[PDB]
Amino acid sequence: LHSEIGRLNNQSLLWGPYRPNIYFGTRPRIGKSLMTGLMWGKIESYTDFQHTVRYTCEQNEGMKGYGWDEYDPRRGGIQSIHDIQNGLDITTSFVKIPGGAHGGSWAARIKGTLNDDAPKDQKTIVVFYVSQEGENSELEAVPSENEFGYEGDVILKGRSEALGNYKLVVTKGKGVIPQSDHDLSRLRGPGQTVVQSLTYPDEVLWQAKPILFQQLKAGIDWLVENKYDVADPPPPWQVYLLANKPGSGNVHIVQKVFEGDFEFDILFSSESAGKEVTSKDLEREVKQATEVFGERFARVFDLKAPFQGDNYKKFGKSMFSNLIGGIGYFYGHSLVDRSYAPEYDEENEGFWEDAAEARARHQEALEGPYELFTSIPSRPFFPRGFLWDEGFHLLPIADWDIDLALEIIKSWYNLMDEDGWIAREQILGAEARSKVPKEFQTQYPHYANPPTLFLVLDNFVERLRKLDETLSTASVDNPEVGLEYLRRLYPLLRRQFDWFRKTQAGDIKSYDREAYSTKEAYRWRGRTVSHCLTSGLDDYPRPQPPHPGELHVDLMSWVGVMVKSLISIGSLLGATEDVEFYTKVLDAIEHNLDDLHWSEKEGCYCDATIDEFEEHKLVCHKGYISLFPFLTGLLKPDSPKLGKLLALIGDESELWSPYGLRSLSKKDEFYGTAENYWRSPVWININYLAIVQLYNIATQDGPYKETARDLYTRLRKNIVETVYRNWEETGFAWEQYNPETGKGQRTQHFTGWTSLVVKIMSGHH
Numbered sequence: 001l002h003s004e005i006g007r008l009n010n011q012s013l014l015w016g017p018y019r020p021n022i023y024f025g026t027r028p029r030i031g032k033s034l035m036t037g038l039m040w041g042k043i044e045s046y047t048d049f050q051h052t053v054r055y056t057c058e059q060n061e062g063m064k065g066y067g068w069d070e071y072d073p074r075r076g077g078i079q080s081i082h083d084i085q086n087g088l089d090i091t092t093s094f095v096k097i098p099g100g101a102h103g104g105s106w107a108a109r110i111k112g113t114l115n116d117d118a119p120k121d122q123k124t125i126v127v128f129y130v131s132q133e134g135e136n137s138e139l140e141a142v143p144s145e146n147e148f149g150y151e152g153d154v155i156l157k158g159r160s161e162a163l164g165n166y167k168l169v170v171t172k173g174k175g176v177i178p179q180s181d182h183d184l185s186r187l188r189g190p191g192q193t194v195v196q197s198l199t200y201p202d203e204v205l206w207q208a209k210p211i212l213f214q215q216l217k218a219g220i221d222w223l224v225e226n227k228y229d230v231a232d233p234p235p236p237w238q239v240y241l242l243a244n245k246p247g248s249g250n251v252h253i254v255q256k257v258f259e260g261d262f263e264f265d266i267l268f269s270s271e272s273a274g275k276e277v278t279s280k281d282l283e284r285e286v287k288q289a290t291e292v293f294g295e296r297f298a299r300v301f302d303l304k305a306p307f308q309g310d311n312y313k314k315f316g317k318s319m320f321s322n323l324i325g326g327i328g329y330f331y332g333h334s335l336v337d338r339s340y341a342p343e344y345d346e347e348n349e350g351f352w353e354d355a356a357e358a359r360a361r362h363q364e365a366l367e368g369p370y371e372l373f374t375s376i377p378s379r380p381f382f383p384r385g386f387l388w389d390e391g392f393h394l395l396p397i398a399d400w401d402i403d404l405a406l407e408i409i410k411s412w413y414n415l416m417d418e419d420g421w422i423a424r425e426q427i428l429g430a431e432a433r434s435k436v437p438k439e440f441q442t443q444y445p446h447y448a449n450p451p452t453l454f455l456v457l458d459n460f461v462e463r464l465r466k467l468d469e470t471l472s473t474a475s476v477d478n479p480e481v482g483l484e485y486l487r488r489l490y491p492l493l494r495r496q497f498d499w500f501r502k503t504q505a506g507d508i509k510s511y512d513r514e515a516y517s518t519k520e521a522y523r524w525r526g527r528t529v530s531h532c533l534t535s536g537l538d539d540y541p542r543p544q545p546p547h548p549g550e551l552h553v554d555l556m557s558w559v560g561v562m563v564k565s566l567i568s569i570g571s572l573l574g575a576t577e578d579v580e581f582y583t584k585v586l587d588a589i590e591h592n593l594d595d596l597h598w599s600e601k602e603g604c605y606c607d608a609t610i611d612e613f614e615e616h617k618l619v620c621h622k623g624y625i626s627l628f629p630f631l632t633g634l635l636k637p638d639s640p641k642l643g644k645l646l647a648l649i650g651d652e653s654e655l656w657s658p659y660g661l662r663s664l665s666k667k668d669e670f671y672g673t674a675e676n677y678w679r680s681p682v683w684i685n686i687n688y689l690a691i692v693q694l695y696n697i698a699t700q701d702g703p704y705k706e707t708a709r710d711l712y713t714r715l716r717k718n719i720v721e722t723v724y725r726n727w728e729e730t731g732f733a734w735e736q737y738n739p740e741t742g743k744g745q746r747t748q749h750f751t752g753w754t755s756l757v758v759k760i761m762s763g764h765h
Contacts, residue, residue: 002484005474009403012074012471013373014103017094018329020376021383021435022056023066023081024092024110025129026268028103030162031331031371032133036266037208038110039127042086042118043237043257049125049216052086055209056435057380059748065731067379067749068325070317072296073404074468075289076106077325087118095285098467099273102164107282111263123178123237123259127212128170128266130252131205134160141195141246148189149244154254165271170254171279173264178257182234184223188241194255197247205250206431212253215242292468300399304763307720315724316758319733323755324397326376327408328383332369332429335441339363344446344525347548352528364442372426373411377752378735383435385412385426388536391452392685392753398456399759401472402463405456406485412453413492417445420492420499424449424534446525447534448504450558451496454565461486461568486569493569494578497562506551508596512615516591522555523548530674540663540678541621541670542607549610553597554625557632560589564633593629594641603644605629622654622665624678624686631689637702646697646707649690657739659722660687660715681745682737685753687719692765716760723757733757 019025025037041053057066064082071077074096081090091111098104114122132139137160144150156168172193179190196215204211219242228234237257246252256264269276301320303312341358348354374385375393390412398405415422423443427433433441460475464482475482506523508515515521526534527546535554543550563586570579597605599618605628606620620626627645629635635642648654654665660682664671672680691712698708722737726744733754734744759765 001478002481005403005471005478005481008467008471009407009474011103012098012468013404013407015096015106016073016327016329017076017325018327018373020057020326020328020379021431023054023090024079024094024108026094026106026108027329028163029329029371029373031369032202033160033162034130034132034139034158034166034168035205036131036168037129038092039129039208039212040086040088040090040112041125042088043123043125043240046233046236046239048236049240050213053125053209054083054086057383057749059380059732067318067751068321070290070293071321071325072289072293072401072468073324073327074401074471075292076286077289077293077321078286079325086124087115087122088124089113089115093282093286095282095289097273097277097281097285100164100270101272102162102166102270105270105273105277106268107277107285108266109263109282109286110266112258113261121259123257124262125237125240126256126258126262126264128254129208129212130156130168130254131208132158132160132250133202133205134162136161138248139250139252140248141197141252143246144195144244146189146192148187149192149194151192154193154195154246156252163270167269167271167276169265169267169269169276171265171267173256173258173262175262175264176259178235178237178259180235180238182238183232184228184234184238188238188243191238191241191257192244194242194244195246196242196253196255197245197249198251198253199249200251202250203430206429211251215253216240219243296400301758301762303761306717307761311728312720312724312761315727316761318727319723319751319755320396320400320758322733322749322751323375323393323758324400326379326383326751327374328376330372330374330384330426330428330432332432333366334368334370334423334426334428334443335364335433336367336423336443336445337364338367338445340445344444346525346527349547351548352546359442368428370415370426370428371411372415372428374408374426378747378750380749381747384428384432387412387422387424387426387449388452389753391450391455392688392756394453394456395459395688396755396759398459399762402460403472403475406460406475409453409456410485410489413489416492416496419445419502420495420497421445421503422449422496423447444526446503448500448524448526448555449534450536450554451500451562454493454561457486457493457565457569461565461572464572483572487573490566490569490573490575493562493566497559497566500559500562504555507549511549511610513596515595517588520556520559520585520588520592521551521596522559523550524552524555537624537663537678539675540623540625541668543609543617543619547609549608549616551596551608553593553605553607554628556589556593556597557628557634560586560593560629560634561632563589590634593634597629598641604648621668621670622648623668624661624663624683627690630693631686633693633696637697637700637704642697642704646694646704646711650707650711657682658718659737659739659742660684660719661690662739663736677736677746680739682719682722682739684719684723684737684756687715688753688756688760691715691719691760695763695765716763720757720761723754 027035062085066081076095079092093109139158142155152172154170267277343354343358506521567582602620604626606618663678694712732748735746735750
């Protein structure tokens with residue numbers, strides 16, 4: 001029965017608009033299969049279309065905003081695109097019809113409304129692009145009855161081993177289509193829908209913009225050869241109509257030209273299900289999906305005061321939809337240095353100089369291919385998987401559909417190598433690579449990343465202890481199924497636990513260092529003079545200069561996070577001998593945290609080095625790190641240490657801003673310095689951690705209960721209000737928030753862990 005629920009998940013999830021990197025497109029969770037993509041662009045001149053056409057997501061002055069208003073990966077949703085440069089408001093409704101053996105049918109409606117500042121007679125080119133990968137698959141445009149193209153529907157008939165027999169329909173649509181009076185119209189027709197059927201080698205099918213322009217250039221070239229010139233030129237929009245050439249190939253371009261407003265449907269019908277999907281079907285299914293989404297949101301995201309209002313529900317719905325709407329499917333080779341150079345051991349002083357040099361050898365090679373099914377931090381800037389980012393993304397998603405979360409966990413853990421390493425950044429496929437500057441492509445098997453995924457596993461277990469509808473929760477409702485998942489997964493967690501210990505261990509036994517345990521002490525590999533990429537808090541101030549003697553309090557606490565999860569998961573499966581070792585390791589970390597990291601002079605935890613005279617120095621920079629053992633849920637509520645920390649959090653002159661907790665205290669000499677990623681600004685992800693911990697202290701018999709309650713109340717308000725104000729003003733979620741002015745800065749469309757704000761509003765942690 002485990003594989004039963006599994007088999008039904010595969011099916012429910014297989015289709016999706018899983019191409020977050022582009023404005024709108026669909027592809028299933030299969031590496032080499034059928035992919036679609038939408039392009040549009042105004043045409044005012046003979047040259048302008050190359051600059052206007054939209055495809056892959058961007059964010060600039062040209063585009064106001066965009067994203068999902070509602071979205072379930074199981075049902076579909078609705079997307080709003082507000083395009084200034086093209087005078088266009090676009091709606092993409094996507095919807096999935098369960099049926100057959102192949103993962104259902106699906107449908108989409110593309111609706112374009114000129115805004116007020118567009119000419120009422122604007123000519124807009126629209127392209128739906130369709131490609132298929134595989135050796136023994138076939139896709140064919142049924143040709144038109146009319147001479148030069150299509151007066152109505154365009155029907156694609158295809159077959160693959162993966163999808164079986166299907167047909168894809170691009171409907172006639174509503175809207176004025178411009179007619180041309182020119183001599184050209186004898187040969188090209190006056191204006192109609194047109195199709196071109198091409199074949200390219202599979203590996204380039206994704207490069208749709210160039211493929212398209214290659215045809216457009218080909219057409220213009222033809223005009224020039226055939227004596228169409230400046231004496232009597234055809235109108236621009238007719239020059240950019242492709243000559244109709246339907247047939248079979250791995251690439252089909254469907255082109256429409258519209259005058260004024262327009263809309264059209266795409267209907268994908270699985271042969272193996274009932275009768276085909278019709279426009280009346282899509283309308284019905286859309287409407288019902290909206291209602292189910294409405295209903296679930298109220299249950300799962302019941303916003304507590306003072307955020308019960310409609311304004312905040314709209315905002316909550318947008319933060320969530322964007323987060324879960326950003327899920328994509330990725331497939332391709334990763335780029336790895338398997339050289340395992342000695343210099344990456346980082347055991348000499350000046351080790352960054354060494355490791356720099358090993359990198360310059362360039363022994364990295366492509367490998368895989370691999371698949372990953374994941375949410376992303378940002379459609380326009382970061383449409384790929386990030387290791388620690390995902391722990392936070394899944395916290396709201398877990399709430400909404402735990403089975404989907406567990407699917408994403410499973411996907412991530414399938415990337416783990418023999419040693420128990422997952423690359424912190426998953427760039428699978430040339431399409432993913434296309435958007436990444438070469439310097440950042442190569443992954444390194446000695447680079448760690450905060451095990452934030454464990455945090456979601458935490459939520460699962462607590463839920464465990466205590467049809468679309470059914471499947472979302474199936475893995476908690478049916479605990480035989482629940483435990484089986486954790487059974488298969490456990491080894492890999494354990495492997496990763498050990499991996500941390502083998503590769504990210506610090507030195508006690510070789511230094512002027514005493515502590516309750518000699519085993520437990522951790523250091524991030526990867527670190528450069530000014531940076532520590534692998535910790536996540538890339539430019540948070542660290543010991544100077546970097547040094548193999550370092551120990552890093554954040555890292556230690558992350559290990560704490562894992563031991564606690566393994567303990568809990570171990571119990572659930574009765575790994576006697578295993579639980580015991582974890583309990584030893586835990587007990588040690590608690591003691592050693594205090595021994596190695598706690599400062600009495602400073603009343604908070606700190607990082608550590610060894611000196612210009614070879615003894616153990618603590619180095620305190622009041623900030624997020626300083627709070628780490630707290631943020632990670634490692635302190636007993638009655639702890640005095642807890643006390644002095646809550647002092648630090650609450651302290652206006654240190655961390656406490658009107659807008660949330662500052663990455664780093666104003667008292668620190670490094671406040672506001674360098675590039676200032678983590679040297680002041682406000683981060684929803686760390687603030688989220690704090691808020692959860694406060695609430696835990698605040699709902700327990702214990703001596704801080706009431707200092708906790710005041711802090712949770714005020715932080716929760718501060719954080720939500722900043723994200724909201726900024727969303728209201730700019731329509732975006734932002735990567736971080738200015739501590740002085742409250743303004744969103746850095747990466748827009750960051751959904752992204754800024755979406756955690758729906759979980760902050762809905763309380764009950």
